[PDB]
Design an enzyme around this catalytic site. Structure first.
Site: not given
Length: 345
Positions: A31, A148
């Site tokens: 995205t 992450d």
């Protein structure tokens, strides 16, 4: 040039940017934008991975901060020896932030999947562990937290494999070179910057995040512990998608959650009278009862090197982030005595 209605740059394999980059392949997307393989014709058609961010304000501003992180890494690693992915260029192309990096091999998740989730051999787990510790200790010393880390964001420099066996069953594969790099600094946060509350991907997320107690570098250490488990067994340590169940799994595997953390959390709904709310004989109860056992139970051999791996992993998986091993400490752990000189630098 033009954009589509989603704000992607309209481009195809064959196209150029900056009179410099020739698009020759697709590497993936999301995205945020797309990542394409290009030949850099200002650097002799060398291969690069070019991340082209959508022309949407939130993604542009996030990419600016990513570039700032990558700049700091580059500023501080002049011998390219701390194993973070190297940014070679960045630019704003008609509102699209573009970031060029070294083109590497398959990620460690992809490789595991291609090996039918058969785990990495222990010496491979050990060398990758050492490398992750070394890379992130460097980050951590520069007031940065990745936030992450997961096997998808750890890439092999070269993912060529050797076949061990190929019975007429899945091919049993070992990577030839276990040199890795840490990638995807799009969530990396400096100590002074705003901290996103919910960080990390589910399986790699620590208890202080879940409990909204504040987080810093120890977040990454927890993620690394989870990653090593997964490299060693081939399956995730915490296979869940809900916080209460996740905390319960943590307690079943690792021992009791410190009382001080429970008193401090705003997530009081998960507890009652200091204990996790959990119906152990319900359907989910039996499943966690069946599948989630004490950490040492997952050892595959009783030998010293396995015992050492599991001691380090336990230290990485400490509930209290203030008690959790630091990566500087981890690099001195006896598990790494089994590295070779070639591995050890």
């Amino acid at each position: 040039v033009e954009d589509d209605k989603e704000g992607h740059l309209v481009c195809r394999i064959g196209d150029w940017l900056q009179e410099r980059y020739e698009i020759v392949g697709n590497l993936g997307e999301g995205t945020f934008g797309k990542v394409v393989e290009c030949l850099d014709h200002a650097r002799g058609k060398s291969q690069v991975a070019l991340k082209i961010i959508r022309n949407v304000g939130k993604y542009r501003e996030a990419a600016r901060l990513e570039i700032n992180v990558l700049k700091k890494i580059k500023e501080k690693d002049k011998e390219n020896k701390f194993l973070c992915v190297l940014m070679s260029d960045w630019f704003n192309f008609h509102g699209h932030m573009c970031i060029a990096f070294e083109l590497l091999g398959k990620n460690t998740f992809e490789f595991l999947k291609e090996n039918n989730f058969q785990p990495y051999p222990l010496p491979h787990v050990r060398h990758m562990a050492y490398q992750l510790c070394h890379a992130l200790r460097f980050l951590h010393e520069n007031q940065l937290t990745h936030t992450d880390l997961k096997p998808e964001n750890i890439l092999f420099v070269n993912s060529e494999f050797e076949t061990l066996y190929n019975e007429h069953s899945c091919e049993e594969k070992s990577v030839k070179n276990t040199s890795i790099r840490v990638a995807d600094f799009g969530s990396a946060t400096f100590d002074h910057e705003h901290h996103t509350t919910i960080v990390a991907t589910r399986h790699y997320r620590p208890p202080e995040v879940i409990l909204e107690l504040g987080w810093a570098q120890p977040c990454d250490v927890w993620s690394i512990g989870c990653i090593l488990f997964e490299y060693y067994r081939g399956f995730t340590l915490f296979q869940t998608h809900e916080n209460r169940e996740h905390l319960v799994m943590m307690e079943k595997i690792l021992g009791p959650i410190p009382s001080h953390m429970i008193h401090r959390t705003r997530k009081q709904k998960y507890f009652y009278k200091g204990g996790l709310v959990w119906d152990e004989n319900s359907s989910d109860g039996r499943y966690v009862k069946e599948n989630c056992k004490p950490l040492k139970s997952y050892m595959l051999q009783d030998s010293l090197e396995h015992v050492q791996l599991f001691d380090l992993m336990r230290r990485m998986l400490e509930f209290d982030p203030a008690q959790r091993i630091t990566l500087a400490e981890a690099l001195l752990h006896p598990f790494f005595a089994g590295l070779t000189p070639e591995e050890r630098s």
